Design a protein around this ligand. Sequence first.
Ligand SMILES: CC(=O)N[C@@H]1[C@H](O[C@H]2[C@H](O)[C@@H](NC(C)=O)[C@H](O)O[C@@H]2CO)O[C@@H]2CO[C@](C)(C(=O)O)O[C@H]2[C@@H]1O
Length: 165
Amino acid sequence: PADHWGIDSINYLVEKGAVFEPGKELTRAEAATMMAQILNLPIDKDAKPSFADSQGQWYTPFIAAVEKAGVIKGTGNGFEPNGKIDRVSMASLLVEAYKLDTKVNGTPATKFKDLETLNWGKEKANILVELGISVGTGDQWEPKKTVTKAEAAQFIAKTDKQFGT
Ligand SMILES: CC(=O)N[C@@H]1[C@H](O[C@H]2[C@H](O)[C@@H](NC(C)=O)[C@H](O)O[C@@H]2CO)O[C@@H]2CO[C@](C)(C(=O)O)O[C@H]2[C@@H]1O
């Protein structure tokens, strides 16, 4: 929709063939697929990723591509392609895909109460904040909240337009 948020982002992604169901929650496999396409990675049809849990499905060669490019690791217990992706995992995808750690000077400050107490991925969220890719709300960044398709489009369109090649 025209005056609706996300439209310039989604058009950018459509223009680059990387993506309406904007409020739909995104799975980790769908996020990885958007990455594989925006990065223009080579997609070998029968290439398989390492992960036992990511075989035999439409997303499988896309996951293999972003694993080969170093963009995804597992969770440690596989890739969990059909689990919903949360914001801190999204951050991890973008930081790895675009080497965003080389785009900031030193270590970004922590600007949110709920990034301070985080088990993993604090640094990656802070980098997104530092780069203004995540605007962030008030005093909560909500690292474990799931990402919608339109929110993913914004993160990716914004990041790629700035740092893509
Ligand atoms: C192996 C590793 O450290 N992975 C990180 C992360 O790994 C977490 C566990 O989630 C996490 N497991 C749980 C159940 O929370 C574990 O406790 O700590 C690991 C880090 O020490 O998992 C992310 C999953 O999503 C992506 C995009 C991904 O690449 O799939 O990014 C991963 C991070 O790189």
